Design a protein around this ligand. Structure first.
Ligand SMILES: [K+]
Ligand SMILES: [K+]
Ligand SMILES: [K+]
Ligand SMILES: [K+]
Ligand SMILES: [K+]
Ligand SMILES: [K+]
Ligand SMILES: [K+]
Ligand SMILES: [K+]
Ligand SMILES: [K+]
Ligand SMILES: [K+]
Ligand SMILES: [K+]
Ligand SMILES: [K+]
Ligand SMILES: [K+]
Ligand SMILES: [K+]
Ligand SMILES: [Mg+2]
Ligand SMILES: [Mg+2]
Ligand SMILES: [Mg+2]
Ligand SMILES: [Mg+2]
Ligand SMILES: [Mg+2]
Ligand SMILES: [Mg+2]
Ligand SMILES: [Mg+2]
Ligand SMILES: [Mg+2]
Ligand SMILES: [Mg+2]
Ligand SMILES: [Mg+2]
Ligand SMILES: [Mg+2]
Ligand SMILES: [Mg+2]
Ligand SMILES: [Mg+2]
Ligand SMILES: [Mg+2]
Ligand SMILES: [Mg+2]
Ligand SMILES: [Mg+2]
Ligand SMILES: [Mg+2]
Ligand SMILES: [Mg+2]
Ligand SMILES: [Mg+2]
Ligand SMILES: [Mg+2]
Ligand SMILES: [Mg+2]
Ligand SMILES: [Mg+2]
Ligand SMILES: [Mg+2]
Ligand SMILES: [Mg+2]
Ligand SMILES: [Mg+2]
Ligand SMILES: [Mg+2]
Ligand SMILES: [Mg+2]
Ligand SMILES: [Mg+2]
Ligand SMILES: [Mg+2]
Ligand SMILES: [Mg+2]
Ligand SMILES: [Mg+2]
Ligand SMILES: [Mg+2]
Ligand SMILES: [Mg+2]
Ligand SMILES: [Mg+2]
Ligand SMILES: [Mg+2]
Ligand SMILES: [Mg+2]
Ligand SMILES: [Mg+2]
Ligand SMILES: [Mg+2]
Ligand SMILES: [Mg+2]
Ligand SMILES: [Mg+2]
Ligand SMILES: [Mg+2]
Ligand SMILES: [Mg+2]
Ligand SMILES: [Mg+2]
Ligand SMILES: [Mg+2]
Ligand SMILES: [Mg+2]
Ligand SMILES: [Mg+2]
Ligand SMILES: [Mg+2]
Ligand SMILES: [Zn+2]
Lengths: 190, 111, 151, 49, 51, 127
RNA sequence: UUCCUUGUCGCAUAAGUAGCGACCUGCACGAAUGGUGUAACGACUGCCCCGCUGUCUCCGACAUGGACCCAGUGAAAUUGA
RNA sequence: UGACUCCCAAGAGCUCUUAUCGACGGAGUCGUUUGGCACCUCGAUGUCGACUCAUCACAUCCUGGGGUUGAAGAAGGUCCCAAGGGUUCGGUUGUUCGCCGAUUCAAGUGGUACGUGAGUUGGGUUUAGAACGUCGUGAGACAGUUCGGUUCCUAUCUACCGUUGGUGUUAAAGCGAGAACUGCGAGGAGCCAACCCUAGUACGAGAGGACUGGGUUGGGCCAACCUAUGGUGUACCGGUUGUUAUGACAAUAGCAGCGCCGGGAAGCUAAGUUGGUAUGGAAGAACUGCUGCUUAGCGGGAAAUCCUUCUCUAUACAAGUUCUCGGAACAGGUUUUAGAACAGAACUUCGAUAGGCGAGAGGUGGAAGCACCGCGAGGUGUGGAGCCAUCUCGUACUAAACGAA
């Protein structure tokens, strides 16, 4: 499944063959040796994360879908200009179209980040993370998960530089961990 | 494919988790069901809801069904998630013979 | 499955596909465009499977698709005996040439396991009984492997 | 909209430059029938058909 | 950008921009800019050259 | 969405029978269940507090458009109905005084979170 | 037919340079270049209401033919360089 | 001329010129008004208004920061700083304008050929028809009114939105490649309200009623997503009308441009659901103070400026870095989460990439055949039956290296 240069890179690093590679900038104290396995217990339930992925592809798209332009009337004499952009500038001053003018073109299949995505549940047996709401991308495609920049997690609670499980640990014995919501009913104090 | 397979496995386990704690009867279109509904928006107020099942969708843990009834002379339609924990008790009272899975013609019915 | 439109409205498209399947059953091998053959193979397999079921319901369903008494008789007798132990894959299609006139890529499509077939088919192998699959996590645990020593 | 000027041979040659044909990298010749063909094209079955 | 902020950012660019617009505008200009080696301090890698 | 031109039934005893919405007080697309609208009175009873042609405020208590709830449930009514509330004091932008004294028909659970507590107190049936 | 003028009053609308009914100050109506009405009639020009709707709030999905691509054939206005 | 700024200060302001103003008179600034000139265009530069899409200036309408007040507080007045983000829907009218109604934090003023018709309209105006009033002997006319009245163009260049192909970037294989980065630089993001606590506190005789700080709920705008909801779902399931055919029965098929109705999973989509509308640092606007002692220095200081979060970015020519390969990388074929072509991504036979087959889920809603009841239309049972758009799982039967290539 790999080209020979990629296979040689994996061979010379001494790691098993992987499907997707991604580089993450870290500070010096956060470095981990080559071959360290990272699980879903890197994150703590209740914390917020930033999720990055390649969005859904939409192909070549017009101004109405791409930029929420209003278009033209469906009747009252309108002549073959129902979904077009209308005017694209001013006349002779400036005598040109400015850069960044919203026009038709390719839409989607681009990298985007969703900030402050809330981690609901951690399943360490299956390495599954339940996280609230939408995440960019198609099913079966890869996404990248970092600490949230805006709602920064508590420093004293994160496993640093990662969660280091012992090898004497059974996959069957780990139970899923749910975010603690507290004991104050949000529907009963209002 | 593996992503959808994982979703199916997790949904199947979630459905079997709920059905071992609560008793949920089989609900078909045309059934007269009575149920107690807790509404957490209104200070967790519990009310008894009775009506005829007019629609159903099988979607695992997120299965839904729809109830049509009259409340003080005004027709009120309510959709509920079948495995919602705010449904305290569901009873089937009567079964009307119907020919279809969706009974949206009952909205146009005089009664 | 991607169901192709073939530049035809639905009535014309389905009539053409029914005629093509009937001609394929009658002649045992026809030449057409690669795209039409990629559409015809699925319906021809469905007709063979209807002949293998063999019931009155299967006969009535098949008589609503294919045209001709000889075609339906061939399906329910000769194809039923021939493909009796073959699970699926009763047809073979192979690209042959570029058509003069519109540069359409052409393909033979044929029923297999008969005299003067294009290639020798594998023996009709019955399917093994349904296996319960492993979990994706157990499978992922078994899929981990290193680079072979080739340096 | 009409062209404002005649297009020079230089600009026409620049435009038609990438549209030149390129040679096919792999060509198959059957040793039996002698047909010259691309990969994944059927010409002959073997003997004892 | 002010001169103070440019000096805080990269003081070699101040000299490079002063020299650049004093040179004739022709195709030899960037070749002459290639020969202008500016350093913010006293240290440079050309100590083996005949300075 | 209840918007400009929508004709609504009046389900209190303020004396009006039908109103036409002028605007939703909040929302570009219009008003959903539990929202407050500005309306003008089209039909009124001969002896009532509210006369035909008056500009009034009304709280939507029945809506034909389905409204989702916090646990995934939905509710939908057959028609569109309002309960008239006071609009002479425009600095009280909170729970408004109903003009009438009785409310007929079902009333949504949404009125508590939107703080229409007087209408919820006056209601007999809650759906 | 009234410039001033969106004259003023009334009906109507949440709001009506509109419409209808008034008034008379007719810039610059008026009795076969007919005056004033008028049932019936009008693909004539206004105004209001019910029904109805993607006209709109606010646009979405789908279907055919073009547009795209490949193989044949193969125009046009225009053009100082 | 107009708009705005300034100078003087009689007088108004209980006293008091300049808190707010300001007579008689003066000095400017701008280039939006009304105009003047007639230099460009009459071998053509198509109007006003609306629509669509905007962008700039700041003489700032809102939001942000201040000085002063004839500033107790609340609400204001006035001036200074500030262009980051905003600045509504309707009724009459062709209208711009303006009035009115309901809102809003506010509903700014101007430039862009009074921005924008090879982007849309065509209601007014401004050809030919007709009518009224008026003027003319008349043919006719009106700067008055009224009804009607063909809106062409396939984009060559610049610009702009996207997508690729080639090419420079000595390397040591005259080198050719696959990955993973850094980010010179560029773009994007930038809003507001109401309620509650602080607090019925400060202030005030009372009525009234805060600054600051912190929460909650909304609205708008932006970025995604499809679990559920709604719409659609033209090769899914069922019902049904007319007709033709399979002789009839039975069961179907064609056409009525899905024949028409009721449903409908996936996919797409918003009317649905999520996520943002931060943080920290630096320099600093009006203004504000401290040090000096005449030159100045220093501190604080805003929705503004520059980094930081987000996206692109080595054709960044001082052309960058790291790992790896060397029959490498491509190409071809089966496809797809990607897609106009191209490109990306998966798989390519020691292989589940597509088709088929089998099972399950999901949709539809109770097949045929047979039996029973009924004169019959029909009803009941066998039986959550039969069928299959999709999805998952199993499986090399077919096509992908069947490449003895
Ligand atoms: K007159
Ligand atoms: K007469
Ligand atoms: K007529
Ligand atoms: K000027
Ligand atoms: K001219
Ligand atoms: K301000
Ligand atoms: K002030
Ligand atoms: K403007
Ligand atoms: K125009
Ligand atoms: K032009
Ligand atoms: K040009
Ligand atoms: K759907
Ligand atoms: K049917
Ligand atoms: K028929
Ligand atoms: Mg719009
Ligand atoms: Mg539209
Ligand atoms: Mg036309
Ligand atoms: Mg059209
Ligand atoms: Mg120019
Ligand atoms: Mg999906
Ligand atoms: Mg250089
Ligand atoms: Mg007039
Ligand atoms: Mg009036
Ligand atoms: Mg009149
Ligand atoms: Mg006369
Ligand atoms: Mg006469
Ligand atoms: Mg007459
Ligand atoms: Mg061609
Ligand atoms: Mg002038
Ligand atoms: Mg000319
Ligand atoms: Mg200013
Ligand atoms: Mg104050
Ligand atoms: Mg602005
Ligand atoms: Mg009207
Ligand atoms: Mg208007
Ligand atoms: Mg203009
Ligand atoms: Mg303008
Ligand atoms: Mg133009
Ligand atoms: Mg055009
Ligand atoms: Mg006109
Ligand atoms: Mg005369
Ligand atoms: Mg006209
Ligand atoms: Mg046009
Ligand atoms: Mg940078
Ligand atoms: Mg969107
Ligand atoms: Mg969905
Ligand atoms: Mg779904
Ligand atoms: Mg649905
Ligand atoms: Mg029959
Ligand atoms: Mg026919
Ligand atoms: Mg016919
Ligand atoms: Mg048809
Ligand atoms: Mg349907
Ligand atoms: Mg539907
Ligand atoms: Mg300072
Ligand atoms: Mg500071
Ligand atoms: Mg480079
Ligand atoms: Mg592709
Ligand atoms: Mg498969
Ligand atoms: Mg079912
Ligand atoms: Mg049937
Ligand atoms: Zn051969």
């Amino acid at each position: 499944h790999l080209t020979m240069p990629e296979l040689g890179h994996f061979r010379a690093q001494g790691v098993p063959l992987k499907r997707k590679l991604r580089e993450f900038p870290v500070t010096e104290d956060a470095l981990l040796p080559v071959g360290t396995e990272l699980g879903v217990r890197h994150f703590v339930p209740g914390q917020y994360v930033d999720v990055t992925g390649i969005t859904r592809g939409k192909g070549f798209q017009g101004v109405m879908k791409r930029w929420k332009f209003k278009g033209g009337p469906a009747s009252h004499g309108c002549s073959k200009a129902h979904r077009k952009g209308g005017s694209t500038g001013q006349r002779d001053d400036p005598g040109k179209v400015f850069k960044g003018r919203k026009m038709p073109g390719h839409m989607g299949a681009a990298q985007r980040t969703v900030k402050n995505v809330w981690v609901y549940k951690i399943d360490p047996a299956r390495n599954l993370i339940w996280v609230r709401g939408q995440v960019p991308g198609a099913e079966g495609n890869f996404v990248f998960i970092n600490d949230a920049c805006y709602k920064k997690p508590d420093i004293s609670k994160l496993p640093f530089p990662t969660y280091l499980a012992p090898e004497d640990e059974d996959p069957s014995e780990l139970e899923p961990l749910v975010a603690d919501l507290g004991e104050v009913d949000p529907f009963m104090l209002a | 494919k593996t992503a959808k397979h994982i979703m199916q496995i997790v949904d199947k386990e979630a459905v079997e988790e709920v059905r071992t704690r609560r008793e949920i009867p089989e609900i078909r279109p045309g059934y007269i069901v009575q149920l107690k509904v807790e509404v957490p928006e209104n200070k967790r107020r519990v009310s008894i809801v009775k009506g005829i099942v007019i629609a159903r969708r099988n979607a695992g843990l997120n299965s839904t069904f729809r109830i049509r009834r009259l409340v003080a002379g005004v027709g009120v339609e309510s959709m509920f998630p079948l495995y919602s924990p705010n449904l305290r008790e569901i009873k089937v009272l009567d079964k009307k013979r119907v020919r279809r899975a969706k009974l949206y013609y009952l909205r146009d019915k005089m009664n | 499955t991607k169901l192709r439109k073939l530049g035809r409205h639905t009535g014309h498209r389905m009539s053409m596909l029914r005629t093509l399947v009937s001609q394929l059953v009658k002649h045992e091998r026809i030449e057409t465009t690669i795209t039409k053959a990629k559409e015809v193979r699925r319906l021809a397999d469905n007709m063979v499977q209807l002949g293998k079921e063999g019931s009155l319901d299967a006969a009535r369903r098949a008589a609503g698709f294919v045209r001709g008494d000889d075609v339906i008789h061939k399906i329910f007798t000769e194809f039923a005996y021939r493909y009796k132990d073959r699970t699926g894959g009763y047809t073979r299609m192979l690209r042959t040439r570029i058509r003069v006139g519109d540069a359409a890529p052409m393909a033979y499509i044929e029923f297999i396991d008969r005299e003067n077939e294009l290639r020798q088919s594998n023996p009709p192998t019955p399917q093994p009984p349904q296996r319960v699959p492993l979990d994706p996590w157990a499978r992922s645990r078994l899929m981990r492997q290193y680079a072979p020593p080739k340096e | 909209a009409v062209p404002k000027k005649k297009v020079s041979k230089h600009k026409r040659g620049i435009r038609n430059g990438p549209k030149a044909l390129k040679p096919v990298p792999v060509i198959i010749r059957c040793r039996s029938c002698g047909r010259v063909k691309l990969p994944h094209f059927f010409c002959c079955s073997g003997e004892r058909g | 950008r002010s001169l103070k902020d440019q000096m805080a950012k990269d003081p070699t660019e101040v000299i490079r921009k002063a020299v650049w617009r004093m040179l004739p505008t022709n195709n030899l200009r960037d070749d002459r800019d290639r020969k202008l080696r500016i350093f913010e301090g006293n240290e440079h890698p050309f100590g083996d050259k005949p300075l | 969405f209840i918007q400009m031109g929508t004709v609504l039934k009046v389900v209190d005893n303020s004396g009006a029978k039908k109103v036409m919405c002028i605007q939703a007080l909040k929302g570009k697309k219009g008003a959903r269940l539990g929202d407050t609208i500005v309306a003008s009175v089209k039909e009124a009873m001969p002896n009532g507090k509210v006369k035909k042609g008056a500009v009034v405020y009304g709280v939507v208590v029945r809506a034909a458009m389905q409204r989702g709830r916090v646990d995934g449930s939905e509710v939908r009514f057959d028609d569109n109905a309002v309960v008239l509330v006071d609009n002479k004091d425009k600095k009280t932008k909170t729970d408004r005084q109903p003009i009438g004294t009785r409310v007929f028909g079902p009333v949504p659970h949404e009125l508590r979170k939107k703080k229409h507590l007087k209408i919820l107190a006056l209601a007999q049936h809650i759906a």
